[PDB]
């Protein structure tokens, strides 16, 4: 065998485009048409030509071959690479212990290329099955405890035990299982509560070095402050459970599709909820336990929302996030002295705000004073707040540190197991006292960091290049998610995800999960996870969002269309965009030009828009389709009088309706990301639309969601006309811009120009529309909350609003005021319960009519003449505070609706089922 040598820098190892996908297959474009193709390896050293310019390291001979069908299906995106075969006698385990490098040279031996090797594929093929059959983490049983961590490429792994004061009390070399590649150590039950970390000795391809470092348990179920050490815990311990925990039941059913359809979500954040509530005990503000302060404005508010129809609370990241320091002395919040901020934040101390350091004001008081002179030319509020955000307690938390441990900063005591009971106490309070189910936001699509050096890199330190998705040529961790893209298509990560969800389900009694960027997950993986969880809780609900994956080349993604008929819900952006207007990418003038159905598209144009009546009627089509569950097979009459199925209604080049059942669709017009509903209406509302009209626009926008068949979802505060002062992405904009005032003084609008880094290009349009009308005050907030509760109350007032089954929707739901002769902005939906619909689902009525007049004109409906239509008792009871205030039902049967109004009419059921409102044949 000729000796590979350099030509007798540009000939040294470069890139990492070689892929060791299975025991005997290596896919690499470098050895193509090359005479000498080898796979060099070194246990403890780095391959490199010796001084003699020769690569005198051990290797295996690679022979050209064709990619098998097994590898082709597993990695479609690699099926194109030149395939190479390894001898069937090579010691895979031995080579995986160190560095492997693919080298190609000419017949004469001179090197032509050398590259690092990606081994995730061979890792699964070799150890996955065996490793999948085992359980991980610090498992505390009756006989004692068993620690287990998967580290198939590590040369050494030691279990390091620490005392409460964090002194090493023992370092145990673990036992490696040859079949699985997992390491374990069994001890006595006295290790309960002990802190620990795994001391790793493993080769990391990014640094090309056998690293030595201690890492927390990715299966950690308890942690020390700021997640520095994992901790042994038995979640079953009654000491970690609030009184009566085991008997906690779901206040709302989620068994049948009809049950699921009634879901009405309120997306909340732990600090957003209580950070500003002075009626919440000071020590609980921004904490899980704030939910237990029954006499506070916040809790009382949520209680009333629940009583009125809100069924679920969805929590932004409450798993262990990385972007908030849990050591209180390293943190400074706006309610504290500016002097504290200067001592914990050196950036502030060296800024133009340094002069406030020895002042006697709180940061909050300083921010308040900076408001008067704040403008697009002097955005001083955000300037100061941007420095504040670096060391405060605020962050949405979409930055996974540990997937199966509650976040520590939201606990009154972040050290050890304490947070576990506090978290459960909150869950119990929400379900038992507030009467709402709980949904958790999960972020398995990425990790906070990767590599062998970052503090928050956990998974990529233990099994390098396995848990992260890498670029096919460079080996670099991709960041399409934002951060460190994970690899759910890899078996052991899929298992980690499922095992994690099992704990949140069983041990924390979470009722549902919302997957962040779910389309970055293989459809097969999401479904497998659901199958495993349904075994634990048959009624658990899974849903997610995203819509910009780009991973189709690697596997079938969990997208809106691919999930059709699976029962997995997905946020629908169809009705969202049609009602809000425009899209998430809009900036500058487009923000004002792109009005939506909820802001007067076509019927009440602002001075910049160019929207045509046809474009406005198209949005109405998307809106009606959404109110009917955004079904692919739902039949309606479009803006041109044409008979169309939901899938035929275009949505920016994609088929609008995609679902099989309304329970697979989550409608919404506001969410944590992107501008709040109120800020969008402020950007879009015509100058002449007065304050009272804008409040009704907010209610009308929300009416399309609440009175629709899809699952209803809304952002915490929409009922309060919540504003973020135009901030589009407020994930790190602190308490200041994310403020929700449960004392009802204002909606946090106009409290300074938003962050310049992200909204700077919008300062011009903001200054132009910001002061159009007055800032909502207590009168407006109370009026909106009333409108909001009226809507949620109407949604649960009849099972006809939440049919659940797609076929049933098609059999009962229809629309009026459609076609080319339609009155723009008037949405009229009928729901049948008459003889022709089948069984009577509502003993009180034979049918319901939902009329939403999103227009500055009064509209008269003649469709139901002689039908004896009556206004809903719920709206009648609201009198002139109703969204239906002013509605009139004449003697003949015609109905007149005032501008910007919403009316729910009904056909009182007689002695027997009546004619109802049969769906018209099309
Ligand atoms: O902290 C990281 C990241 O958090 C926030 O984004 C989270 C996800 O938000 C979705 O709306 C978006 O589609 C995804 O791509 C994001 O991962 C925050 O908005 C962002 O600025 C931060 O980088
Ligand atoms: Ca944390
Ligand atoms: Ca912050
Ligand atoms: Ca890609
Ligand atoms: Ca009936």
């Amino acid at each position: 065998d000729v000796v590979v040598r350099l030509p007798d820098a540009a000939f040294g190892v470069a890139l990492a485009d070689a892929h060791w996908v299975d025991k005997t297959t290596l896919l690499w474009p470098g050895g193509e048409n090359k005479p000498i193709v080898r796979l060099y390896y070194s246990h403890s050293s780095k391959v490199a030509a010796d001084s003699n310019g020769e690569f005198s390291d051990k290797y295996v001979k690679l022979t050209p071959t064709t990619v098998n069908q097994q590898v082709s299906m597993r990695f479609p995106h690699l099926a194109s690479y030149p395939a190479f075969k390894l001898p069937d006698d090579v010691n895979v385990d031995e080579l995986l212990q160190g560095e492997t490098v693919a080298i190609a040279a000419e017949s004469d031996g001179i090197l032509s290329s050398a590259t690092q090797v990606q081994t995730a594929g061979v890792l699964d093929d070799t150890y996955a099955a065996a490793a999948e059959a085992l359980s991980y983490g610090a498992q505390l049983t009756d006989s004692g405890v068993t620690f287990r961590v998967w580290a198939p490429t590590a040369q050494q792994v030691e279990l390091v035990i620490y005392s409460a004061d964090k002194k090493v009390i023992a370092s145990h070399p673990m036992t490696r299982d040859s079949a699985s590649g997992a390491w374990s150590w069994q001890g006595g039950s006295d290790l309960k509560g002990a802190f620990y970390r795994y001391a790793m000795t493993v080769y990391h391809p990014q640094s090309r070095k056998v690293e030595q470092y201690e890492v927390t348990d990715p299966y950690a179920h308890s942690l020390s402050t700021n997640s520095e050490y994992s901790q042994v815990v038995d979640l079953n311990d009654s000491a970690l459970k609030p009184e009566g925990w085991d008997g906690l039941t779901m206040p709302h059913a989620q068994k049948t599709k009809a049950d699921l359809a009634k879901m009405t979500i309120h997306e909340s954040h732990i600090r957003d909820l209580s950070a500003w509530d002075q009626t919440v005990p000071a020590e609980l503000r921004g904490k899980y336990l704030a939910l237990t302060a029954q006499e506070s404005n916040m809790v009382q508010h949520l209680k009333q929302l629940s009583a009125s129809g809100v069924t679920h609370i969805e929590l932004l990241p409450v798993f262990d996030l990385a972007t908030v320091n849990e050591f209180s002395d390293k943190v400074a919040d706006i309610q504290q002295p500016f002097s504290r901020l200067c001592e914990v934040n050196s950036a502030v101390k060296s800024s133009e705000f340094a002069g406030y350091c020895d002042s006697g004001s709180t940061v909050e008081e300083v921010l308040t004073q900076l408001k008067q002179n704040d403008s697009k030319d002097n955005p001083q509020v955000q300037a100061l707040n941007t420095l504040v955000a670096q060391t405060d307690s605020y962050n949405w938390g979409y930055d996974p540190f540990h997937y199966t441990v509650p976040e520590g900063s939201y606990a009154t005591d972040p050290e050890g197991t304490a947070r576990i009971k506090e978290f459960r106490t909150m869950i119990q309070a929400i379900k038992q006292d507030l009467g709402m189910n709980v949904i958790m936001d999960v972020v398995y699509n990425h990790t906070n960091a990767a590599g062998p050096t970052d503090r928050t890199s956990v998974l990529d330190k233990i099994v390098p290049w396995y848990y992260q998705r890498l670029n096919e040529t460079t080996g670099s961790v991709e960041s399409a998610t934002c951060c460190s893209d994970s690899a759910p298509e890899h078996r052991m990560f899929a298992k980690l995800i499922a095992d994690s969800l099992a704990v949140w389900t069983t041990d924390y009694k979470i009722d549902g999960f919302r997957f962040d960027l779910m389309l970055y997950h293989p459809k097969a993986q999401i479904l497998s996870a659901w199958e495993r969880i349904k075994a634990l809780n048959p009624d658990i609900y899974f849903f997610g969002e995203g819509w910009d994956s780009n991973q189709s080349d690697r596997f079938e993604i969990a997208s809106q269309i691919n999930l059709k008929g699976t029962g997995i819900g997905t946020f629908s952006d169809r009705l969202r965009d049609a009602v809000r207007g425009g899209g998430p990418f809009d900036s500058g003038d487009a923000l004002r030009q792109n009005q939506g159905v909820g802001s007067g598209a076509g019927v009440l144009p602002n001075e910049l828009t160019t929207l045509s009546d046809d474009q406005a009627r198209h949005l109405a089509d998307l809106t009606r389709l959404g109110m009917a569950g955004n079904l692919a097979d739902f039949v309606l009459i479009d803006k041109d009088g044409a008979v169309k199925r939901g899938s035929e209604i275009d949505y920016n080049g994609a088929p609008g309706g995609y679902a099989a059942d309304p329970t697979e669709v989550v409608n919404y017009v506001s969410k944590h990301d992107n501008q709040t509903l109120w800020d969008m209406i402020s950007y879009k509302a015509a100058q002449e639309a007065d304050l009272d009209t804008r409040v009704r626009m907010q209610a009308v926008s929300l009416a399309t969601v609440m009175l629709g068949q899809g699952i209803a979802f809304d952002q915490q505060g929409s009922e309060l006309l919540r504003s973020k002062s135009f901030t589009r992405d407020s994930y790190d904009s602190g308490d200041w811009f994310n403020r929700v005032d449960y004392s009802l003084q204002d909606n946090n609008y106009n409290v300074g120009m938003p962050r310049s880094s992200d909204d700077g290009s919008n300062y011009d349009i903001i200054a132009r529309v910001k002061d159009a009308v007055a800032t909502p005050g207590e009168t407006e907030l109370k009026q909106m909350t009333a409108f909001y509760q009226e809507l949620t109350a109407l949604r649960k007032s009849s099972p006809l609003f939440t049919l659940g089954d797609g076929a049933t929707v098609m059999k009962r739901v229809d629309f009026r005021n459609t076609g080319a002769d339609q009155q723009t902005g008037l949405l009229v939906m009928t729901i049948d319960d008459g003889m022709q619909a089948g069984a009577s689902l509502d003993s009180r009525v034979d049918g319901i009519v939902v009329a939403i007049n999103a227009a500055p004109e009064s509209r008269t409906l003649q469709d139901f003449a002689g039908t004896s239509l009556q206004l809903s008792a719920i709206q009648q009871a609201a009198g002139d505070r109703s969204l239906a205030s002013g509605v009139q039902v004449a003697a003949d049967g015609s109905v007149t609706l005032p501008a910007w109004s919403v009316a729910v009419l009904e056909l009182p059921q007689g002695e027997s089922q009546g004619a109802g409102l049969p769906v018209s044949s099309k």
Side-chain angles (χ1 to χ4, degrees), residues 227 320-321 326 407:
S227 323
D320 179 39
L321 46 131
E326 304 186 340
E407 160 62 8

Short mmCIF file of all heavy atoms in Angstrom, two decimals, residues 227 320-321 326 407, ligand 2:
data_model
loop_
_atom_site.label_atom_id
_atom_site.label_comp_id
_atom_site.label_asym_id
_atom_site.label_seq_id
_atom_site.Cartn_x
_atom_site.Cartn_y
_atom_site.Cartn_z
N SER A 227 -28.37 26.25 37.17
CA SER A 227 -28.10 24.98 36.49
C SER A 227 -26.65 24.51 36.44
O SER A 227 -26.28 23.75 35.54
CB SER A 227 -28.63 25.05 35.05
OG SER A 227 -29.85 25.78 34.99
N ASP A 320 -36.19 24.75 32.06
CA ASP A 320 -34.99 25.50 32.41
C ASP A 320 -34.36 26.29 31.25
O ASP A 320 -33.70 25.71 30.38
CB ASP A 320 -33.94 24.57 33.04
CG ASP A 320 -32.65 25.28 33.40
OD1 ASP A 320 -32.70 26.43 33.88
OD2 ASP A 320 -31.57 24.68 33.23
N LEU A 321 -34.58 27.60 31.23
CA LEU A 321 -34.01 28.43 30.18
C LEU A 321 -32.61 28.87 30.60
O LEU A 321 -32.26 28.78 31.78
CB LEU A 321 -34.89 29.65 29.88
CG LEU A 321 -35.45 30.46 31.05
CD1 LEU A 321 -35.19 31.94 30.81
CD2 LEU A 321 -36.94 30.19 31.16
N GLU A 326 -29.83 32.98 37.37
CA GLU A 326 -30.65 32.63 38.52
C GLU A 326 -30.05 33.06 39.86
O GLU A 326 -30.67 32.88 40.91
CB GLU A 326 -30.94 31.13 38.50
CG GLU A 326 -31.62 30.70 37.21
CD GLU A 326 -32.05 29.24 37.22
OE1 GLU A 326 -31.50 28.47 38.04
OE2 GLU A 326 -32.91 28.88 36.39
N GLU A 407 -37.86 26.11 35.25
CA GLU A 407 -36.93 27.23 35.26
C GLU A 407 -36.74 27.66 36.71
O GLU A 407 -37.69 27.66 37.49
CB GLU A 407 -37.50 28.40 34.43
CG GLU A 407 -36.87 29.76 34.76
CD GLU A 407 -35.38 29.83 34.47
OE1 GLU A 407 -34.82 28.88 33.87
OE2 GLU A 407 -34.76 30.86 34.84
CA1 LIG B 2 -32.51 28.67 34.04
#
